Design a protein around this ligand. Structure first.
Ligand SMILES: Nc1nc2c(ncn2[C@@H]2O[C@H](COP(=O)(O)OP(=O)(O)O)[C@@H](O)[C@H]2O)c(=O)[nH]1
Ligand SMILES: [Mg+2]
Lengths: 165, 158
């Protein structure tokens, strides 16, 4: 059929590993090693057609890697996750975007902005600011919570629907 | 009390504190203690690159073929990182070379995809089935073609 290479990027501790395990194993991992980078494969059906997803959960960004570099170049979709209770993570989203822009060497790249930890009520980043950044970039914005499975499936499905368009 | 002691052992192995691990090991800490996913102290010591902690844990009785929630053994983590000293020590104590995770991937598959050629040569020496297919139907040779690894292709073909 068709295979998709989806890359999950963001700051450390934002919930990238919990997001990917929730999609695949339908389970919330309370604690995961912050340095393990691995690629997983899933078979899901989107709006009636089955497909294969090749998802990379990036980690350890301070050291050069060969698999990550190849994944970034050939990546078809990019999840830009950030935590809503950490302002520094949100500011880092621009840093990742410009690096992906120069790596891919393009102005229009299938991208979906993700805000994790929706269940924590100590919110520091408001929806208006996140939506304003998404509208300026032109990419859809979604709210997710790996603890309560809130919008986990809609995040990945929307990204695939963005690649098709 | 017993569970709190185990959580200290896992952190000491990950941090790489030789004195801390030995003290907790004689205190009654369990070598087979694991966190939520299933990482044992052998999983974390092999991952981060500590040799003496792996040797000490193995002699105490840590299970060499334990797997986490995704079915990955300590040989998997050491192969994906490029730890040539650790993998040979793990093979010397009788570890499974043809183990598979929930995606049916062999430590050869992981090392070949990341690009560690010296790790691949050791696994091929100790009898790693090159003609192994995962649950999605790929071989280590297919990885070399897809990733354009001519050096890996030469090793795989030979
Ligand atoms: N409350 C809450 N905590 C989360 C959520 N996602 C992740 N976490 C916590 O964030 C911590 C670190 O996340 P982690 O999986 O390491 O993200 P990573 O560093 O990008 O791999 C974990 O201990 C989780 O308990 C969420 O949706 N809600
Ligand atoms: Mg992670």
């Amino acid at each position: 059929m068709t295979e998709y290479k989806l890359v999950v990027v963001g700051a450390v501790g934002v919930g990238k590993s919990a997001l990917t395990i929730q999609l695949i194993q339908n389970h919330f991992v309370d604690e995961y090693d912050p340095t393990i980078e691995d690629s997983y494969r899933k078979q899901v059906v989107i709006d009636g057609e089955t497909c294969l997803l090749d998802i990379l959960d990036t980690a350890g960004q301070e050291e050069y890697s060969a698999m990550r570099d190849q994944y970034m170049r050939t990546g078809e979709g990019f999840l830009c996750v950030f935590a809503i209770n950490n302002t520094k993570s949100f500011e880092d989203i621009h840093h990742y975007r410009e690096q992906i822009k120069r790596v891919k060497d393009s102005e229009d790249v299938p991208m979906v902005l993700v805000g994790n930890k929706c269940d924590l009520p100590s919110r520091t980043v408001d929806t208006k600011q996140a939506q304003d950044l998404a509208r300026s970039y032109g990419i859809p914005f979604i709210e997710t919570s790996a603890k309560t499975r809130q919008g986990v499936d809609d995040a990945f499905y929307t990204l695939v629907r963005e690649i098709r368009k | 009390r017993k569970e709190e002691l185990d959580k200290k052992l896992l952190e000491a192995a990950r941090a790489g504190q030789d004195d801390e691990v030995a003290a907790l090991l004689a205190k009654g800490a369990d070598v087979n203690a694991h966190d939520t996913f299933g990482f044992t102290p052998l999983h974390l010591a092999a991952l981060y690159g500590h040799l003496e902690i792996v040797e000490v844990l193995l002699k105490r009785g840590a299970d060499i073929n334990a797997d986490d929630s995704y079915g990955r053994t300590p040989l998997h983590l050491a192969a994906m990182r490029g730890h040539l000293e650790i993998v040979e020590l793990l093979l010397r104590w009788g570890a499974d070379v043809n183990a598979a995770d929930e995606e049916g991937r062999t430590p050869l598959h992981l090392a070949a995809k990341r690009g560690h050629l010296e790790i691949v040569e050791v696994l091929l020496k100790n009898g790693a089935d090159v003609n192994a297919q995962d649950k999605f139907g790929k071989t280590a040779f297919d990885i070399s073609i897809d990733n354009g690894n001519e050096d890996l292709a030469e090793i795989l073909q030979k």
